[PDB]
Amino acid sequence: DARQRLKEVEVDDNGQFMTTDFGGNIEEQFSLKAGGRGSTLLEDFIFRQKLQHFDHERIPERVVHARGAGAHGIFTSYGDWSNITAASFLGAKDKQTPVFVRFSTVAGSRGSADTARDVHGFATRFYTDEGNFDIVGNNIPVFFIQDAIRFPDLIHSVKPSPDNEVPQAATAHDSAWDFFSSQPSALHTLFWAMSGNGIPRSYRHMDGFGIHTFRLVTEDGKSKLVKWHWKTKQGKAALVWEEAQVLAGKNADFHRQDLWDAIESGNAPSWELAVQLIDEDKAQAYGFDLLDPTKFLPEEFAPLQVLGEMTLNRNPMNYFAETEQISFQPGHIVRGVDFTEDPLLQGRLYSYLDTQLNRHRGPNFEQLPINRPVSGVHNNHRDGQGQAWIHKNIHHYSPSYLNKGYPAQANQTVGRGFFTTPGRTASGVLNRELSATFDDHYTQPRLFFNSLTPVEQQFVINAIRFEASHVTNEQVKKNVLEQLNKISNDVAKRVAVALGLEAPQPDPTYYHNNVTRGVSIFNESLPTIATLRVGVLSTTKGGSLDKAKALKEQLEKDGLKVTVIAEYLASGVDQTYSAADATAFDAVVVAEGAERVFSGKGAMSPLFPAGRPSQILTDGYRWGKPVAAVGSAKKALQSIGVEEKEAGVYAGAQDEVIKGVEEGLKVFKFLERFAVDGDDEE
Amino acid sequence: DARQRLKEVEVDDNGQFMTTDFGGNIEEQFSLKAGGRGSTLLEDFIFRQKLQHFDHERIPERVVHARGAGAHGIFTSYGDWSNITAASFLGAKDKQTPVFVRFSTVAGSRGSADTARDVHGFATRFYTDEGNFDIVGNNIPVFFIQDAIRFPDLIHSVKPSPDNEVPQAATAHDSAWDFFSSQPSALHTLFWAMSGNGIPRSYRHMDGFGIHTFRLVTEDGKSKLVKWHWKTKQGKAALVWEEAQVLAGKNADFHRQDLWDAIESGNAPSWELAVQLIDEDKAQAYGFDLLDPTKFLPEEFAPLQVLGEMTLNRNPMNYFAETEQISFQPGHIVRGVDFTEDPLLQGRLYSYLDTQLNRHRGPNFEQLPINRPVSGVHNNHRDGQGQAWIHKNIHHYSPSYLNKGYPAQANQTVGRGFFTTPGRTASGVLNRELSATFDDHYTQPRFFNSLTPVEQQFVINAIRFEASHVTNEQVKKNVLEQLNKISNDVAKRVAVALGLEAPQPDPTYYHNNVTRGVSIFNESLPTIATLRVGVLSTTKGGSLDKAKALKEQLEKDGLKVTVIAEYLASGVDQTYSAADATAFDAVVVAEGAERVFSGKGAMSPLFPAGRPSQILTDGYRWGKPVAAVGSAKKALQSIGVEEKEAGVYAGAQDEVIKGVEEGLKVFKFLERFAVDG
Amino acid sequence: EQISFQPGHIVRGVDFTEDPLLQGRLYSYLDTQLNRHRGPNFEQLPINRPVSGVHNNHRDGQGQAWIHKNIHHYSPSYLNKGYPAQANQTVGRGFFTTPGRTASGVLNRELSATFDDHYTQPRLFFNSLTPVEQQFVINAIRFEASHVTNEQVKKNVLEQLNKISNDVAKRVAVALGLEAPQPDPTYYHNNVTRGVSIFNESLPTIATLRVGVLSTTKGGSLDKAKALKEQLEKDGLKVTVIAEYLASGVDQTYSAADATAFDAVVVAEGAERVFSGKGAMSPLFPAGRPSQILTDGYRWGKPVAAVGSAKKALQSIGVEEKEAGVYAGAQDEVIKGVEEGLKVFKFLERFAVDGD
């Protein structure tokens, strides 16, 4: 149990009487009043201590990544990696370290939709025996900007306009695209956010990236440059934008429920921890500066080397005390790892320490149960708001004769202390510049786009088309066009069509045809269909429900989560048509006999909105999901104009439908149903 | 200008050089580094002062009503109401007072959807010349509970489950309906939230209520029990649930953008301030206790009397500094008004003062510009976090010989001070009880009688939707037993969706009484100004030119028209990819645009498959006025809709416009929604 | 520093009264913790936690240190099975307001007329003190009011003091150079009550009381001071031997010593050398410091003593062994006297009284 250390602070209220926060049993359902219908007394200490705690429940949301969810788990190392790092948690085969991971979006506030289009956070804490080590990552390997001092500008431009606070959780407005086109470094991450990475199917279907080049350091002090990767064992998978939008309204907790259900049902998700390793003397040897956070390292140049695997198997007990209160920091570093001169990472180190003082209203936030290490804290820090400990050492200073030198200094050779990479040097003038090696803002965006499938490329273009069409200012849109044209003339011309702007002329300085692996989502089927959702649309009339039950039981044998849907909650029905939507499922199957609710009287009922079963089937097909119908229910396929032998469409008896649906869930999205530019011309 | 007093804190950065927050021109786009590719220096004071302010931007959200928006305006008194109130802002005909209003939901956090189903906040501050007076109200005249000590229990049960923080901005889960059925006083507000009041069309289409009985007190101390009412001059209007769900994802800012656009375009919304006035001897005269906030006073027993009008005509300059930071309080009371022994109002007075300490992390929040009164502050308060003034009176205590007695005491006789109603008394033992007069929780919900038949189905279908999400079978059964105490028919129709058997009739509280003013769909809209028409066109053929002429004549009646086509050609406001029917009050197909509902024109890569047909289908099924000009009838036929239907218009441009504008007064065509049976 | 006291921290079996001062305290101690502790969870601090267990539906707040198991954090509720459950007078040992307390009358912003006597009990308190104890009060008032620059405030104070006692006002008026006001006898009375005097009762024990022994590193004084100390410590006294420097057996130097630190001062024999002449002029302490300590100790009413030839030190400051609280002779004589004097603690014979 990864939460084992947290059980000492867990409070069980069952079987007990109500109390105040300072003890004493009470009743707290009536205010103390001066007379039968009199005014409430100031001396009602019970009322005041109850309402004051309610009044003070909220803490500030995170300044970025305010919307997200998390879970506990275990990380297991696959070997003794002392040959590359002194990091304790990687020092032996099958060594296990408790983790907590929080996934998130970036721009939206606390109550915004999971399926907004956005970069996604992927923050992992290792509770190692030599301190907490945090990898505060994203599901995209490059970031918008090259210097941390520009972070407020980026975030202000993509967060709501400061006059009306419109729009929520979205880059589709003037200020954001004004910034993307005025700061061309941002276009690489923008392309990633405009792809499937911006609308993933779940937290469990994302890769993770530390983005920055870090350093692994051995006991003798030798170092190597390193990139952190998390590779999902569930496979990468993404939605389509028109589906993500409906899902934002139908279930804004789609992603956090996904992770919770997967863990509750015993299908804990896993990611493998992998690294790219680079010699120090090759930091600038691959066509870009490895200090540049707007660049990723093509796997053709440095392949991923798996070090271990992380499994998230325990949900939190109290979301606020654990998920909301946890405080990640890239400054949470340990012996065996070091920073680099990445100007974006450099400022992060200051920013995450500082912002905790705003979120937690004091300096003792590492004493919170979810932030505490398991390795012990011994120093001369004292006092501060909410000090939860009572220190014994009264000589709280160093050096000291009176405390005998304890707590004692630890460094590279004594006490396994942290040490900066010994060979690191500084050379040159103090400057407020960026290295000229950071100047190329277009080559890698072109590289990313080249490496996507044709329909995947169309998704990127259609996302940009959707986003840029919200920009009111004409010049901003033309500025966007000029910047896009430096990535690819074809992308600019296809985006320009939606904008009503003239197709720009080629500017080939950065054009190229190179491609790289690992970057696509839709060119690979899932390695497993466990936890994937199947909506079975049935009816309470006739014998349809009995068949849906058998259809459900066999589908569950393969590890799928099946929801039987009908007019009302008859025996065996999991959900009503009124409460059902196609966004909640990865495949839709119409049970035999349920074709009655797709036409005629059966489709017009007071118990669900008009056309709901037809709409669920239409949404699922148009959003590329595997859809099916058993036996006579093929008439439902007919009523929305879907043909039986289309790709990802399955009609027949129960068993062939079951096999066809499960095969289609591996494909996940059938991209034959999405038009590409040039298809419609006569 | 209602924002006139805020002018002296506005800061213009145009034409200026970047500075730190302590002065000095700077550059702040490059960190100071030791060498060309070096680490950033701690001595970079520019970097840290910029990032420190960014790192500390967020303050805690409101514990409830976290999601909302507001605007400035003016209240105008219609008369000299000194015969009923000593309140100065009501003391003269045509006397104008600046106001700020915040509308909101209740349950959702700050980034939740406007069109979630919820009770809605309607908070108004009068910046009167005798102090700030706030009417912190809802768009529903009754509240869930009868004693403020139960507010954490109510809010904990409605807000997300504390284990996983699911669901956001929704009562449709186990704990809420567990609470609704375990605490039956909640059923009245529950019914209101399950009606059109839970999913309003906009803030400007809501009524508002102070809920509590207050007291108006004249200069000589005579008092009247009073109910505050805001009556919208735009008319009440609501969505349908299946449309509000889609709108929650397509535009989470639907309501705050609507308010912003109405004001910016010069269509300032208005509400009339009206009161119900009854003597003290009527507190228990109408079959319920007026100190009970779960009951409202039927207008048949005390009609509305209008006192003035408020109009919101100026948007904020900085959302955070004005809308986010404003701190409403029911304790914000002035001379001429007093509280009552309402046990729910009683505890609010403590809570709103106390909670400001959490949201603003200091005692000086009334010094913030949007919280400041216009009438002057003179007392012996000193210091505190962020003290923004410098006090001259060094003898900051009373009584005192040294300050000559200033600042001096004010009361009923001298200085127009506040005074509690002189006639109020206390009698009885100290008790942690409620009056037995609070016992009836079912008569007034049996509100349901006063809705139109389809309006009633909406309530049933909302309860059917929400209760179906409840996983515990016994909670569902407990819910049905409580609904059966209000109406056996309601229990039976809800039990159907739950696959349960409704209990046998429990006629204790049954009755067939009705009351006016609580329905929404029984009344056409008085104005269609600011209402929005989506015109579906296509870049091919001569459709665009006709859609522009159609737009031109529709704007002449004050409507907001959006022309939709495959891309942003000349005259196109929005692409099909970016468009959705939730954004419009009416959908009209321009002549020629039938080409994008079938054939090749419907399969362009520029928008998702079937998007034009989806838009017209959405608008019809959600009850909107829908229409098509000339050859565009084909689009109506392609989705099975016919000319002879209510709220569907076909023919020439002149005929379509006349029909659409009249259907927009109807607003929702309820013949398209099936009723049980 | 962190502990947070509240009069509202009340338990079953105790209840409040309608004291208008107490009533407002209950509000202000809860509220002020939000300022001092910047959050609502200050009762979770180790020094503030009860030992009896906390079970309620409070959640979240800054610095929330626990992880609650009950996901149904509300009442009433079927899903939590009614737990945590309500407790009242008859079930659960719950708190309950006194059943018989009643409210009656108009809501008012007033005080009861029964509160209107501000002078009788101040008079009663002053009556029940010893004569020199009364003089300490008068000399405190004379010191305090002489700092008031405003003439009218000084007369306002006298006008109010004259309501308590005309003699008190007269004696204070002297120090202020103001006229003796004429009697205002409305609240004058001669009643006394027990238990309010400090100086009318000797101390029940002298354990922990402090004795400073003034000695010198020259001669054999330190040897005798060590013997004097060992016997005084037998009675539970804390003894500090003082000399020019920290020789063996010295607890404190004259430079660091002051009479304020001790309850009795006794000069060890031979130490009279540091009270006049060369022994009083040394770079190791401020000039006259041993004589200042003895002078201070005497003038502040302490038991002071000298052993043997050290009585010259008492003569050097004009103090004679005849006096109460002054002891001389050999060691055992001085020990028994000083220990007797410590029970009296302060010798009020050394403080002049108005017209004595």
Ligand code: HEM
């Ligand atoms: C490669 C670049 C970056 C990555 C991968 C990244 C990732 C993340 C993630 C995952 C979180 C959420 C942690 C959680 O779930 O609690 C977060 C929060 C945050 N980030 Fe970043 N971020 C990056 C850039 C930056 C920069 C450049 C700054 C400032 C200079 C910054 C400042 C912050 C702050 C202040 C928070 C809030 C932390 C808290 O309130 O506890 N980030 N970031």
Ligand code: HEM
């Ligand atoms: C008839 C009953 C009630 C009405 C009409 C009402 C209305 C409102 C409204 C409109 C707001 C939003 C103010 C804004 O826009 O900033 C609000 C917030 C709030 N309410 Fe209520 N509410 C009621 C019941 C209660 C009760 C019983 C309590 C506690 C005992 C309570 C505590 C609060 C708090 C703490 C806030 C946050 C205020 C702030 O952070 O500035 N409410 N309420």
Ligand SMILES: [O]
């Ligand atoms: O971030």
Ligand SMILES: [O]
């Ligand atoms: O509220």
